[PDB]
Design a protein around this motif. Structure first.
Motif, PDB file in Angstrom:
ATOM      1  N   UNK A  16      41.687  54.845  54.499  1.00  0.00           N
ATOM      2  CA  UNK A  16      42.906  55.864  54.204  1.00  0.00           C
ATOM      3  C   UNK A  16      42.675  57.049  54.988  1.00  0.00           C
ATOM      4  N   UNK A  37      55.229  54.745  56.180  1.00  0.00           N
ATOM      5  CA  UNK A  37      54.515  54.305  55.434  1.00  0.00           C
ATOM      6  C   UNK A  37      55.132  53.173  54.453  1.00  0.00           C
TER       7      UNK A  37
ATOM      8  N   UNK B  39      47.479  53.559  48.313  1.00  0.00           N
ATOM      9  CA  UNK B  39      46.887  55.248  47.933  1.00  0.00           C
ATOM     10  C   UNK B  39      47.309  55.891  48.947  1.00  0.00           C
ATOM     11  N   UNK B  40      47.299  55.799  50.213  1.00  0.00           N
ATOM     12  CA  UNK B  40      48.014  56.457  51.301  1.00  0.00           C
ATOM     13  C   UNK B  40      49.484  57.081  50.950  1.00  0.00           C
ATOM     14  N   UNK B  41      50.183  56.204  50.509  1.00  0.00           N
ATOM     15  CA  UNK B  41      51.789  56.578  49.963  1.00  0.00           C
ATOM     16  C   UNK B  41      51.632  57.634  49.012  1.00  0.00           C
ATOM     17  N   UNK B  42      50.561  57.464  47.914  1.00  0.00           N
ATOM     18  CA  UNK B  42      50.385  58.400  46.782  1.00  0.00           C
ATOM     19  C   UNK B  42      49.648  59.680  47.250  1.00  0.00           C
ATOM     20  N   UNK B  43      48.735  59.542  48.159  1.00  0.00           N
ATOM     21  CA  UNK B  43      48.103  60.840  48.607  1.00  0.00           C
ATOM     22  C   UNK B  43      49.093  61.711  49.275  1.00  0.00           C
ATOM     23  N   UNK B  44      50.117  61.353  49.949  1.00  0.00           N
ATOM     24  CA  UNK B  44      50.938  62.116  50.405  1.00  0.00           C
ATOM     25  C   UNK B  44      52.008  62.717  49.512  1.00  0.00           C
ATOM     26  N   UNK B  45      52.110  62.047  48.368  1.00  0.00           N
ATOM     27  CA  UNK B  45      52.757  62.964  47.378  1.00  0.00           C
ATOM     28  C   UNK B  45      51.941  63.860  46.791  1.00  0.00           C
ATOM     29  N   UNK B  46      50.502  63.570  46.348  1.00  0.00           N
ATOM     30  CA  UNK B  46      49.459  64.404  46.040  1.00  0.00           C
ATOM     31  C   UNK B  46      49.143  65.583  46.633  1.00  0.00           C
TER      32      UNK B  46
END
Lengths: 80, 80
Positions: A16, A37, B39-46
């Motif tokens: 990641x 993504x 998790x990458x997509x979510x980590x962008x949101x984070x």
């Protein structure tokens, strides 16, 4: 519990982190990153995942993402 | 002459491709690739997306993602 994984959390997290390096390599904006993504997610569906499972994975992926956001919300961890 | 490019086609293509190359290089199994992507997509949101908007962005993503899949499935529009 005991979960022996070939792809350890270190492996996954580093993977990641590496694709994040790819994003930051051109420091793409969030909008464009979400586009890239998002297509990459669907890319794996249309590539590896057969159509019937393609639906199931899409729905569980959605629930996963949504509940991850719903997790940091917390708000008393009840309702009131 | 009345055309506006939202993004550069070759730009977006290369972005997606580069991330795909990362998955290619490591040869990620379907489970690992989907896990990393999610998790990458979510980590962008984070990062750049407050939870307030994150809820709607997650739904926006769910909309786009699922409709992209269904766009391949629904070509049999005659049940009436």
């Amino acid at each position: 519990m005991a979960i022996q994984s070939k792809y350890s959390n270190t492996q996954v997290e580093s993977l990641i982190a590496e694709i994040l390096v790819v994003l930051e390599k051109h420091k793409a904006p969030t909008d464009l990153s979400l586009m890239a993504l998002g297509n990459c997610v669907t890319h794996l569906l249309e590539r590896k995942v057969p159509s019937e499972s393609r639906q199931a994975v899409a729905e569980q992926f959605a629930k996963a993402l949504a509940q991850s956001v719903k997790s940091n919300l917390e708000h008393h961890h009840h309702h009131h």
